[PDB]
């Protein structure tokens, strides 16, 4: 049985990374790309938030230092955040560079007209490519990426636009982003 982690689209739930479920609203993540009957961090506090970064209500979240909320995956890909943070079981912690940085650029993914200057936009990162999309739409496309440990590169999170993307990986990518849904409560 494949359930899917909701931060990286993998599927493995091998021995020492399983893919755990909250119990109350149904997603699903691997245990270390959350830094771990269990409840997500959100149903502990009785919340369905928002993204401070992007207009997306679905996937999995993290509690910021000054009370609010953020996915995982957009605290993994918006320069500037220190994501190592929820690793060491402690809060995102966004600075007054982050906070400048809100609506300063358009999605070009969103499917929400009304959202799409919203939160914070990461480009695509192939040669000097200027395409801008939040995290959790280009994640929707199949566009974001991991460097594997091998690969030895000191930010290993990336992001291409359609135009630059591996296609094969964002093929995958795409069909277990729509297996998520399935998922849910
Ligand atoms: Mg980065
Ligand atoms: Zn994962
Ligand atoms: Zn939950
Ligand atoms: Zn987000
Ligand atoms: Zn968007
Ligand atoms: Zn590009």
Known sequence: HILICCVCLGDNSEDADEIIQCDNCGVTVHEGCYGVPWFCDACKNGVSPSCELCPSQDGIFKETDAGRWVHVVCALYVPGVAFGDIDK??????????????????????????????????????????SFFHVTCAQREGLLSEA?????????????????????????????YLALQSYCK
């Open 148 to 176: 594997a440990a091998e690969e030895d590169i000191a930010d290993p999170f990336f992001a291409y636009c359609k135009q630059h993307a591996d296609r094969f990986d964002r093929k995958w990518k795409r069909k277990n």
């Open 89 to 130: 079981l402690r809060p995102v912690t966004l600075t007054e560079m982050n906070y400048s940085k809100y609506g300063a650029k358009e999605c070009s993914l969103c499917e929400d007209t009304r959202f799409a200057r919203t939160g914070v936009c990461i480009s695509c990162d192939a040669g000097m490519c200027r």
